[PDB]
Amino acid sequence: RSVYFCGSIRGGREDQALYARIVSRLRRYGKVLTEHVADAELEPLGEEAAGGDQFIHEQNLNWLQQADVVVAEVTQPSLGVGYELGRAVALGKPILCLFRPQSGRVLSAMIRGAADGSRFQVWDYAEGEVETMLDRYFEAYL
Amino acid sequence: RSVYFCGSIRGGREDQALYARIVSRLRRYGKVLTEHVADAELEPLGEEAAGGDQFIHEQNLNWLQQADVVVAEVTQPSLGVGYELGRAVALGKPILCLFRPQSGRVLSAMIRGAADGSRFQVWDYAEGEVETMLDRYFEAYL
Ligand SMILES: O=P(O)(O)OC[C@H]1O[C@@H](n2cnc3c(-c4ccc5ccccc5c4)ncnc32)[C@H](O)[C@@H]1O
Ligand SMILES: O=P(O)(O)OC[C@H]1O[C@@H](n2cnc3c(-c4ccc5ccccc5c4)ncnc32)[C@H](O)[C@@H]1O
Structure with missing residues (x-):
């Protein structure tokens, strides 16, 4: 049911459109927990998320634990x-x-x-x- | 006694001289298991090591397990x-x-x-x- 998708964010956004294609295909195989990674709107180098990197880290680890399968570009x-x-x-x-x-x-x-x-x-x-x-x-x- | 040093290789060599400085300082605090990461001679994009990425992976995991401390740039x-x-x-x-x-x-x-x-x-x-x-x-x- 649950897929964790990994793709570069602060490593750079060059492949963003590909992540979107990947996430779209994955939805027929399960719930994509990380879908935001593919968002074209997401561009960083801001420093935001208002909850901090700690929140990001913990939230992701929780999803990673729930994940049945991990997919990474x-x-x-x-x-x-x-x-x-x-x-x-x-x-x-x-x-x-x-x-x-x-x-x-x-x-x-x-x-x-x-x-x-x-x-x-x-x-x-x-x-x-x-x-x-x-x-x-x-x-x-x- | 044992330090594992991490630094980019195929992610790129821009910081290589810094890794050398780091590894040099670390030697007074312990055996650096990964010292080759700092080597200026090492440039990749060849594809070599003749033992393959599998050998590299396993050898590094063995060192990582021995390591008392992990240091990463x-x-x-x-x-x-x-x-x-x-x-x-x-x-x-x-x-x-x-x-x-x-x-x-x-x-x-x-x-x-x-x-x-x-x-x-x-x-x-x-x-x-x-x-x-x-x-x-x-x-x-x-
Ligand atoms: O940023 P990288 O390239 O080192 O690592 C990207 C990977 O690590 C996870 N990750 C990294 N940054 C993330 C963020 C994030 C990063 C920067 C932001 C800046 C402003 C506002 C929101 C942000 C969210 N949110 C969720 N997951 C993230 C993510 O699952 C992705 O697979
Ligand atoms: O290559 P990256 O940037 O994804 O990751 C670099 C990190 O991962 C480890 N690592 C990556 N490539 C390594 C190699 C390596 C890579 C490419 C080579 C090409 C030709 C000949 C020897 C090679 C050795 N040897 C030892 N550790 C390595 C290393 O400890 C370092 O900290």
């Missing part, structure tokens, strides 16, 4: 995304990472190297394929 | 650094994050928000202060 380097994956691994959550090699980047060894091909999966994709990728995973997931 | 956004901090938090390691506001960046809410001011600390510093910062922490640490 790992193309844009982000401390927050890495942290969430680290916490998720320790919680024993099934995890799907999606990476775009077409970005010219090489994915982090700690992310790529964390993959077992089962409970932690990393999929390389081309931008137009992302729905199919999500479809494969979640159909298989049953 | 969090100024440059990195998935790997975030991941290491996430794993370290779950292992209950004391943690010191160092951040430079002079970089113009705003630090990740998940990192800043993870801080309790005791077992997880985040210190803002100016580049010339980093030795003093490390000194404060480790003297206090006894």
Whole structure:
């Protein structure tokens, strides 16, 4: 029922439209707890949220614990995304990472190297394929 | 005795000289398990290590478990650094994050928000202060 979606925010918003596409597809497979990550309206570098980073942190950890599945778009380097994956691994959550090699980047060894091909999966994709990728995973997931 | 140092690699090498300064100072407080992170010679985007990301991942997790203290320079956004901090938090390691506001960046809410001011600390510093910062922490640490 519950999906935790991770994507870069203060690591930068370059991929925001992709996060929106990902979140949209995910809604047919479950409740997306993190949907705000995909919001085009959200741009930071303000410093707001009025509850502070502490509130953000605690609220997210609560959602991460509820999550049946964790999905991360790992193309844009982000401390927050890495942290969430680290916490998720320790919680024993099934995890799907999606990476775009077409970005010219090489994915982090700690992310790529964390993959077992089962409970932690990393999929390389081309931008137009992302729905199919999500479809494969979640159909298989049953 | 044992310090795990985290710094960006595939997130980018901009701060490499700082990592070297940090690692150098840390050696008087203990064995630095991760010292290679500070190496100027290390530049990636190759894709090497010949043992693969899996080997890198497992070797680092072994070191992280041995570590008495985790120190991270969090100024440059990195998935790997975030991941290491996430794993370290779950292992209950004391943690010191160092951040430079002079970089113009705003630090990740998940990192800043993870801080309790005791077992997880985040210190803002100016580049010339980093030795003093490390000194404060480790003297206090006894
Ligand atoms: O910011 P990053 O790139 O280090 O990490 C992004 C990841 O960490 C989580 N995260 C990071 N910043 C978040 C925020 C956030 C950040 C900055 C803000 C600034 C102004 C107003 C609201 C804000 C909310 N809200 C919710 N989750 C967040 C999030 O789930 C995402 O997956
Ligand atoms: O690469 P990032 O920025 O996502 O994460 C950097 C963090 O994650 C760890 N880490 C990341 N890449 C690492 C490597 C590594 C990466 C790429 C390489 C390429 C060619 C040859 C050797 C390599 C070694 N070795 C050891 N630790 C690494 C490291 O401890 C550091 O703190």
